[PDB]
Nucleic acid binder design. Structure first.
Ligand code: K
Ligand code: K
Ligand code: K
Ligand code: K
Ligand code: K
Ligand code: K
Ligand code: K
Ligand code: K
Ligand code: K
Ligand code: K
Ligand code: K
Ligand code: K
Ligand code: K
Ligand code: K
Ligand code: K
Ligand code: K
Ligand code: K
Ligand code: K
Ligand code: K
Ligand code: K
Ligand code: K
Ligand code: MG
Ligand code: MG
Ligand code: MG
Ligand code: MG
Ligand code: MG
Ligand code: MG
Ligand code: MG
Ligand code: MG
Ligand code: MG
Ligand code: MG
Ligand code: MG
Ligand code: MG
Ligand code: MG
Ligand code: MG
Ligand code: MG
Ligand code: MG
Ligand code: MG
Ligand code: MG
Ligand code: MG
Ligand code: MG
Ligand code: MG
Ligand code: MG
Ligand code: MG
Ligand code: MG
Ligand code: MG
Ligand code: MG
Ligand code: MG
Ligand code: MG
Ligand code: MG
Ligand code: MG
Ligand code: MG
Ligand code: MG
Ligand code: MG
Ligand code: MG
Ligand code: MG
Ligand code: MG
Ligand code: MG
Ligand code: MG
Ligand code: MG
Ligand code: MG
Ligand code: MG
Ligand code: MG
Ligand code: MG
Ligand code: MG
Ligand code: MG
Ligand code: MG
Ligand code: MG
Ligand code: MG
Ligand code: MG
Ligand code: MG
Ligand code: MG
Ligand code: MG
Ligand code: MG
Ligand code: MG
Ligand code: MG
Ligand code: MG
Ligand code: MG
Ligand code: MG
Ligand code: MG
Ligand code: MG
Ligand code: MG
Ligand code: MG
Ligand code: MG
Ligand code: MG
Ligand code: MG
Ligand code: MG
Ligand code: MG
Ligand code: MG
Ligand code: MG
Ligand code: MG
Ligand code: MG
Ligand code: MG
Ligand code: MG
Ligand code: MG
Ligand code: MG
Ligand code: MG
Lengths: 65, 49, 9, 85
RNA sequence: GUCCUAAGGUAGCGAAAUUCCUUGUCGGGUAAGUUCCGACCCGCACGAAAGGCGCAACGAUCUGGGCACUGUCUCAACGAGAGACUCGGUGAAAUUAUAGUACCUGUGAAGAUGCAGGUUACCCGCGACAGGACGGAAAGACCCCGUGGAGCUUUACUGCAGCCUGAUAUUGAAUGUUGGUAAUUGACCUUCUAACCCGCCGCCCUUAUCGGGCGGGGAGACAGUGUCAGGUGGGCAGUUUGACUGGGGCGGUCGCCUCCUAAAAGGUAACGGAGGCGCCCAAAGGUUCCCUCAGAAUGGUUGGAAAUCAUUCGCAGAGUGUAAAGGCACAAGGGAGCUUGACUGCGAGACCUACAAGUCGAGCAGGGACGAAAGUCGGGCUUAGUGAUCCGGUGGUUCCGCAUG
RNA sequence: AUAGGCCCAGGCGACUGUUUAGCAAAAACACAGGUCUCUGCGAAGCCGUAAGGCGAAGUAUAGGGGCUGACGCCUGCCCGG
RNA sequence: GAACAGUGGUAGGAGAGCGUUCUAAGGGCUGUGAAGCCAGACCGGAAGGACUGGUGGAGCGCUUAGAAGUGAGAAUGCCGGUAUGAGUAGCGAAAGAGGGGUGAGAAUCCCCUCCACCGAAUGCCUAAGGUUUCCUGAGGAAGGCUCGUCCGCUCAGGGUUAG
RNA sequence: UUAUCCUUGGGAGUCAGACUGCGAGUGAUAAGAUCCGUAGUCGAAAGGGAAACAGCCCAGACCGCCAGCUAAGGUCCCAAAG
RNA sequence: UGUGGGUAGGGGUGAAAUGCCAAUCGAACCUGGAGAUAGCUGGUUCUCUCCGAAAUAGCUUUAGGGCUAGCCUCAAGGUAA
RNA sequence: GACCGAUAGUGAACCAGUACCGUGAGGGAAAGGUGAAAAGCACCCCGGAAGGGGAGUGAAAGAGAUCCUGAAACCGUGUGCCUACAAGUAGUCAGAGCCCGUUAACGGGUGAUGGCGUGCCUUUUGUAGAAUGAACCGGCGAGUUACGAUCUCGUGCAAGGUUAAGCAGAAGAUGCGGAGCCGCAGCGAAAGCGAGUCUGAAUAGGGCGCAUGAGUACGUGGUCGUAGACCCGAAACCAGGUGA
RNA sequence: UCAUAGGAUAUGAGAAGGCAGACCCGGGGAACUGAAACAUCUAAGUACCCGGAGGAAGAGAAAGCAAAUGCGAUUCCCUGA
């Protein structure tokens, strides 16, 4: 049978032009009183998946174009 | 699986939605039109053919 | 044949 | 085999180490922004072209060469000087 | 007397099938009695139908003591038979890395036939004995561990049966009565009979204590049953019931900050040594301007050791919201005026780092605060004061909106 | 050849019975007796989805369940949970 | 080809190879003796490969490539065979003795004599169950814990009669 | 002077360590103890020495040789050499 | 005590020991789901060569497991860092 | 039929769902080969027979029914060398003596005596281990395959590459089949814009892209995923039956 | 009372049962297992039991698909993915 996409990951990552994985930041749901504006400003912007994590998860997103 | 450490995908938030009515166009750059003959009526049907 | 065995509790 | 009861300690806590101290060497070339020294208080003062952050971090305001140098009798500063150009 | 309780254990029994201390103490029995019997009562922790205290008879019951009796013993001897032993016949088994398989002291995964150094020993059997081969037998039942089971429990969690209760259908007819609505609909009580029910009687199908039919009688719109609902519910079911740990349990701990251990970068363990935190402040924030603290001596109304006043001395012996450390007197400490930068968009570049996060940041733009200006200001002397994702709420929104709006 | 040893005193269970086939026969279970409690008969209780049954061809002097355990003397106080 | 340097190794990474069965294509071998098996003092850096002789009596190599049920010393592995213990433990409650006979062979079978054991049974009958074990004749490979001429065993025949 | 180093990609294994020396804690300035730091060796390392003896001293086994020089440790005999 | 019958496994039966239900009982036996699952133990078969670890950090219902990092290897680059 | 060849292949090549086990449901084996042909050994001899020795038959009887081959363990007979003062993981290196004579080699067998030397495996910080496993010998006995993913290598074509089902055709190659798939463009949650785009008021800055061009189809190999997924092994759980 | 229930007789190549260890349509319907525990979820409408078949079954001639110049019963394969 075909490999199944990991649907949780597919809802959270996106493949960039060069084959990096774009992601959002954690700590962006609630408790904004406890985080500084600088933190909040930075967590708002997207990020990339780390090398160590990418090798762990790349096959889970193999089908995604 | 990370042996019970909360997995990376679960630590990060879901983002966005998918549009039902998303349109993807077949893009053609000018360089590809350069391959046709001069005074040609370039159309989708010709490009496809 | 012992009740408990060798090095019993 | 009998085993005597034992007490407990009320200690056993410590915070994470904060990796303070010098982050660039005297005579090393730095880019503007480079953290030179992490500290509580001013163990070292900001010299020429150096800034003091909100947590007393000393950082280079220009690109140049790091110089740690005596600041009067008791104190020290760190400065960054532009390269010969 | 006082405190407390729903009430404070009565009678009887008591070192007990119960007594830790304990061989309690005293008496009896014995030459000598941790046992036994009788007393005593500081009952660790008896006690009245999970009965209390007695009790004739009964017991392959347990306990202590006697008479008799004895190879139980002092302490062993002899004899009989069955094996064992020899010959003839027949002929297994567990075990087994290969073995030409000494001893001592030592060594070594810390207890050696096999290693070292010595000591001893001609080759092969047969009867015997079990010290060793950590002998054989059984992948230790103890103990721990496994996010392994099973049985059992309950005021563990979630369910289910059962049971109770309501609504509604089956379910009809009258009568009053009492709530919205002046004439219409709900609730309630009573009555009726025709549904439904009868593990009542007679008759018939019929040789039938089944069933059905027919006729009486009883009961009756109740019950029973269906659907839905709440309660109860270890009766039953599926499961959960943390880790660290000088074994486990029990105790303690679990995240964050500061110091020491930490070996003069950074980092660095232990159930090592010490403390803090889960905030606070509308100023205790920003800026401009001005300033200097502890303590002591001496003088002085109330007024003292110490209140406020004055002088002198005074690197700080103070302060810095709060633990500690590092800092801080061109103050980061104290005072006053005006303020809200405790800004929005960001951010070259760095630190830290497995990741996730965490930290610092010049500078640019917008629009401001204070300042004459220079300039400073994206909270607080610095470093704790916090929690991913999913899910849900609220506000905003040139986004999407399953034929189209 | 075959054919009770006996006695003094105590614990426990009144007694004859019963039980862990194959490591426990007992002081355990049972028991007659006591008491509490449920049950008005299509009884309660129990088995079964139900029909059908046991209860019982019984009917409160009966039936089911809990606790106690011959007999004797007795069985106190607390209804706050 | 030279020089220079290097070449201990568990987990493990990388490389180069050996051998096995099958297939395809070349090419071959073999009753003047295939494979297998046995032996040997041969050859290759290893896995391994030949040669000679014997046994065997009909199939089999080689080259290149392909494909895999492709390599065993351990799993208290599975199945089979055979050891060790060992001529050892045992031979399952009991009274026999002698004479005669039979026979290839006799403690053990038959006959005789005396002796001994059971006798509310170890006797007689009969259930259940077994199913021919019953009777006669013949037999002795196995079964019989020894032996065996005997037997509940082998082979032949036969045998069970109801108002 | 030496030949490493970095990046990207493929493939792992490891997450029980041990002792020794030195610097600390815990302990009794005990433990072949325990827990860190640091170097070594063992692990995964045969050879020589320390009688024997993973972890100490000397020293790293591609093979062959009936050659030679040395290390630690040794040179009366076992036992090579005073 | 014989004969003939009855009760059946989320169940029977129990003068109660968790006893007994065909040498099986804290839940019989057989077949199937089924090659259950096993972070555990055992085992895993030819050769030589090149290189050659780790027994640590972080997080973990985690501690004898795992994941990322560290350390090994192969390739391709950069190249001399 | 690049399937098995008697421990394989069906449990069953054979009188097998038999024998055997179980009250029952149910479980469930072992066991193929004389020779071309029976020509299956007349006759003689020892023996009660079994079994032999001849004689015959046959290509072969050492093919004689326990009958193709006939390994090993294990059991024997003979004897060249050694062995009754020796302390043995059994060898190894040194070595006389004696006995032999080969795939002819600085040969073969034996081995007085000397030196050195605690099996193999597993598991471990560390095992000669007084830890684990194996009595021995033999056979059998463990990373596979399918479909996906990804990387390396190879090949074809290349800003392109490629067909699936299906139809025809040896169960084939191959031809046809362009539906579809991947790539050539990205950025953004999205509308959308596009070598840019998103954020933002911004012609700022910054993120991801471009400039800094290779993919795709197939094959081998490495690894991953889903499947029992390297093999063997629970206690248990559930379903339907069989038993008083 | 009519009558009905019931009874009797006659006629029926009427039914019954088996079987593929397969395929098919229904009724009923697990658990281990995975989730690194576990309850929602998974395993799976699987195994299994039961009923009904037929040579195939089921489905099927639009109260459909869609959003075009539309398509025109069902089933099955490829693809979408
Ligand atoms: K006594
Ligand atoms: K008594
Ligand atoms: K050992
Ligand atoms: K012994
Ligand atoms: K200890
Ligand atoms: K102010
Ligand atoms: K009992
Ligand atoms: K041959
Ligand atoms: K074996
Ligand atoms: K008698
Ligand atoms: K006879
Ligand atoms: K050390
Ligand atoms: K029971
Ligand atoms: K078979
Ligand atoms: K020797
Ligand atoms: K052991
Ligand atoms: K940009
Ligand atoms: K290519
Ligand atoms: K592949
Ligand atoms: K696999
Ligand atoms: K489940
Ligand atoms: Mg939000
Ligand atoms: Mg002791
Ligand atoms: Mg701050
Ligand atoms: Mg006394
Ligand atoms: Mg006495
Ligand atoms: Mg009591
Ligand atoms: Mg009471
Ligand atoms: Mg050793
Ligand atoms: Mg020692
Ligand atoms: Mg010793
Ligand atoms: Mg030994
Ligand atoms: Mg033993
Ligand atoms: Mg042993
Ligand atoms: Mg064990
Ligand atoms: Mg036990
Ligand atoms: Mg329960
Ligand atoms: Mg479960
Ligand atoms: Mg624990
Ligand atoms: Mg402890
Ligand atoms: Mg606790
Ligand atoms: Mg240091
Ligand atoms: Mg330091
Ligand atoms: Mg969630
Ligand atoms: Mg719409
Ligand atoms: Mg009694
Ligand atoms: Mg009695
Ligand atoms: Mg018993
Ligand atoms: Mg009995
Ligand atoms: Mg007994
Ligand atoms: Mg009833
Ligand atoms: Mg009745
Ligand atoms: Mg009682
Ligand atoms: Mg009593
Ligand atoms: Mg009372
Ligand atoms: Mg070397
Ligand atoms: Mg062959
Ligand atoms: Mg194989
Ligand atoms: Mg074997
Ligand atoms: Mg003998
Ligand atoms: Mg004998
Ligand atoms: Mg013996
Ligand atoms: Mg003997
Ligand atoms: Mg004997
Ligand atoms: Mg006898
Ligand atoms: Mg007879
Ligand atoms: Mg015999
Ligand atoms: Mg360590
Ligand atoms: Mg130690
Ligand atoms: Mg190791
Ligand atoms: Mg090394
Ligand atoms: Mg060594
Ligand atoms: Mg030595
Ligand atoms: Mg070793
Ligand atoms: Mg000498
Ligand atoms: Mg039994
Ligand atoms: Mg399954
Ligand atoms: Mg190396
Ligand atoms: Mg584990
Ligand atoms: Mg890694
Ligand atoms: Mg054969
Ligand atoms: Mg077979
Ligand atoms: Mg039978
Ligand atoms: Mg022959
Ligand atoms: Mg032939
Ligand atoms: Mg043969
Ligand atoms: Mg001598
Ligand atoms: Mg001699
Ligand atoms: Mg010795
Ligand atoms: Mg150990
Ligand atoms: Mg073991
Ligand atoms: Mg063994
Ligand atoms: Mg269950
Ligand atoms: Mg039955
Ligand atoms: Mg019966
Ligand atoms: Mg699970
Ligand atoms: Mg049809």
């Amino acid at each position: 049978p075909k490999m199944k996409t990991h649907r949780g990951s597919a809802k959270r990552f996106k493949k960039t032009g060069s084959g990096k994985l774009k992601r959002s930041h954690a700590y962006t749901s609630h408790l904004f009183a406890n985080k500084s504006q600088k933190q909040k400003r930075k967590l708002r912007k997207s990020a990339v998946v780390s090398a160590g994590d990418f090798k762990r998860i790349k096959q889970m997103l193999a089908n995604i174009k | 699986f990370e042996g019970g450490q909360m997995p990376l995908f679960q630590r990060l938030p879901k983002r966005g939605f998918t549009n039902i009515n998303r349109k993807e166009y077949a893009v053609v750059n000018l360089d590809k039109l350069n391959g046709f003959a001069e005074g040609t009526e370039v159309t989708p049907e010709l490009l496809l053919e | 044949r012992l009740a408990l065995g060798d090095r019993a509790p | 085999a009998s085993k005597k009861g034992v007490g407990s300690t009320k200690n056993g806590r410590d915070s994470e180490a904060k990796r303070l101290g010098a982050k660039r060497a005297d005579g090393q070339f730095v880019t503007g922004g480079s953290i030179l020294y992490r500290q509580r208080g001013t163990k070292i003062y900001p010299g020429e072209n150096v800034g003091r952050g909100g947590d007393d971090t000393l950082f280079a305001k220009i690109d140049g060469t790091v110089k740690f140098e005596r600041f009067g009798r008791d104190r020290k500063k760190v400065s960054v000087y532009p390269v010969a150009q």
